[PDB]
Write a protein that holds these residues in place. Structure first.
Motif: not given
Ligand SMILES: Cc1ncc(COP(=O)(O)O)c(C=O)c1O
Ligand SMILES: Cc1ncc(COP(=O)(O)O)c(C=O)c1O
Lengths: 389, 390
Positions: A11-14
């Protein structure tokens, strides 16, 4: 896809709001069959749009012949691409071309990591980078990036970087002059992308070039976003009439395939000797095949068409209620808005058939495929007008 | 024209290669003069399936005509399926372990270790422990982690925090941790060390690194970039030892000739990467991930069992070869120890005998062929090695 995206992707970009499946020229289609005009190009990567015939042909030919070979071996495509980059870099000066070389890697980050490493080979401790600059997310490239809230979590950074206000010739000269012979390199985006769209002021790249020349500092132009014809020239920096020591490239070079490049001329090229730097995928035959196709299409006349299309956009958007200014050059443009409503324009643009991007609250970035038609530019301006209205 | 233009256009990081390759298939490659060789290197363990494997041709030709790069601002099918497929291989039917694991995609081993390095910095702890002769990549963070002084010296200062331990020395690493145990973010290690010849983790070492990491809250981080995608006869070389790491880094074989990397994290490791903390434009590239999907479909448990079989055959035929002391390693990551320091000589002579070999040390020939090499090609490859050293 979207349902199984957050169960498997860090969950780095949503979670992305849209799934794309197909695309063609300056248009892209989602998992429901909705067709949008693409004014982002995956953040200025899709220079020729999706499924361009040059790129399809080049990549299908090459994948059926030869994929990855190490740099323990020579490959036809890397060399052809090196040659053409050095040619576009040299603007007909055969003496410059003959002192220029390219190191191939897989991203802008890796490319700025090779420029960082060249900086370290100067034996000098100081590296200068701009406030609001972005050079990437690997530890060297992040060190170079002028954005505190990105660096904090990962301190300590590889040492040496200090930050200057973008375009402040006076500040940069004094900063250098605090300890001049210990400045390895000065890094700059010819037009800053991440911040918004902030062109180098008139005379700034020349100033930096001349300051580099006294004191023997390398001038490093990050052309990851500005390169491959996006600004109206093959390189943004060509417009300011400067020959940089080092040029870093990625995004638009590979036509949707992962590529990076560190071009170095003179001392900088000689600084990397056998064993000092390396990358396994460097010179990938398939990505370098896609790069050659991009370089065959993005010539002097195609780059001129980008400049005219950027002037067309600026002309049509200045007549639109809600817009105060359009900054930038060619198809790297920032629409400055009266109200801080840019984020909502991106979310309401999808209904008007348009994919937008908002680097700030008052700025909409237009980084469309350079193959965009005049009619698509006209439909896009009307879409932005009826979204902001 | 390729080899004549190379020195005029390419930074001298690798010298001028002796050989221009033009085409390959399965366990063979062909140069621009039309000589064909058995490939026992696969570009350093990259081409798990060889050049122009039909699965990779279809996969990539189909994807380039639909959609290439789309940023992580958007979703595309190929990324989530590769991620789902790698989490299934990682998890071994333990669906809790699968539900707690996530993958960040990038374009190289270096980028994957960069992401792992950053996971480590996000622990709030300062110390990262890496192996002597270990190799994690040549960017500033991944180079930091690389236990080869001569590769890092010209680039100091490095990102701070890396300390090196002797590979396999349990008591040393235990003691190193115990100097300041709550301030060790992560221990990094190759399950089998690659670039300095082929040194496998001693029996019991990975179990001991897990016990140690567990008691002090340290992340165990297995670099599987060379050992991964079926090369060692298990999908992940760490699975041979029965340990579950916190982080697995991948590239090389995952792409089957296309650039790709991946950092898998489970549990707390997975949680440490929150929205905006890391990124890359090309990460989750639809074309590369399409090739990765096709690689994963061919490299199933049965193909991995077969990689193990072919590994034991090489060792058996190479035991009967004069000049060889030992064949270290597993599956199709093999280190051929010689009685003489004649490995480099054997590489140059190899060409003449229709083989691509590689010499990471003065007395070690490293074998990393495409995993698709046949029993019959192994036999001819050994005969060529025997006649080469002979
Ligand atoms: C100007 C600039 N530099 C560097 C990068 C980093 O490239 P990548 O995200 O492919 O590592 C980007 C994106 C960029 O726009
Ligand atoms: C163990 C290991 N780590 C890291 C790398 C670096 O990968 P790349 O050259 O793709 O950056 C390699 C190759 C490798 O074998």
């Amino acid at each position: 896809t979207l349902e199984t995206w957050p169960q498997v992707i860090i969950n780095t970009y949503g979670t992305p709001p849209v799934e794309l499946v197909s695309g063609k020229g300056a248009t892209v289609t989602d998992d429901q069959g909705n067709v949008y005009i693409d004014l982002l190009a995956g953040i200025a990567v899709n220079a020729l749009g999706h499924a361009h015939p040059a790129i399809i042909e080049a990549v299908t030919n090459q994948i059926g012949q030869l994929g990855h070979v190490s740099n323990l071996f020579a490959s036809r495509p890397v060399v052809e691409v090196a040659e053409e980059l050095i040619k576009r870099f040299s603007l007909d000066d055969a003496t410059l071309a003959a002192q220029t070389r390219v190191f191939f890697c897989n991203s802008g980050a890796e490319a700025n990591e090779a420029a960082f490493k060249i900086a370290r080979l100067t034996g000098r401790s100081r590296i200068l980078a701009a406030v609001h600059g972005f050079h990437g997310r690997t530890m060297g490239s992040l060190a170079l990036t002028g954005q505190p809230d990105k660096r904090e979590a990962f301190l300590p950074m590889p040492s040496g970087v200090e930050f200057y206000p973008y375009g402040d010739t006076d500040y940069l000269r004094k900063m250098v002059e605090t300890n001049p012979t210990d400045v390895a390199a000065i890094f700059l985006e010819p037009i800053q992308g991440e911040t918004g769209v902030v062109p180098a002021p008139e005379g700034f790249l020349k100033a930096v070039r001349e300051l580099c020349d006294e004191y023997g500092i390398l001038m490093i132009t990050d052309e990851v976003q500005t390169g491959v014809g996006r600004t109206g020239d093959f390189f943004a920096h060509q417009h300011d009439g400067v020959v940089p020591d080092v040029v870093t490239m990625a995004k638009g070079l590979g036509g949707g395939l992962p590529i990076g490049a560190c071009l170095a001329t003179g001392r900088a090229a000689e600084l990397m000797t056998p064993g000092k730097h390396g990358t396994t995928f460097g010179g990938n035959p398939v990505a370098c095949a896609a790069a050659k196709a991009v370089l065959s299409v993005v010539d002097d006349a195609f780059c001129a068409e980008v400049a005219r299309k950027g002037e067309l956009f600026k002309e049509l958007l200045a007549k639109v209620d809600g817009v105060v200014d359009v900054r930038g050059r060619g198809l790297m443009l920032g629409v400055v808005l009266e109200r801080d409503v840019a984020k909502q324009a991106v979310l309401d643009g999808f209904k008007h058939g348009v994919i937008l991007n908002a680097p700030a609250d008052n700025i909409i970035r237009l980084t469309p495929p350079l193959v965009i038609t005049d009619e698509e530019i006209a439909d896009a301006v009307k879409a932005i007008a009826e979204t902001i209205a």
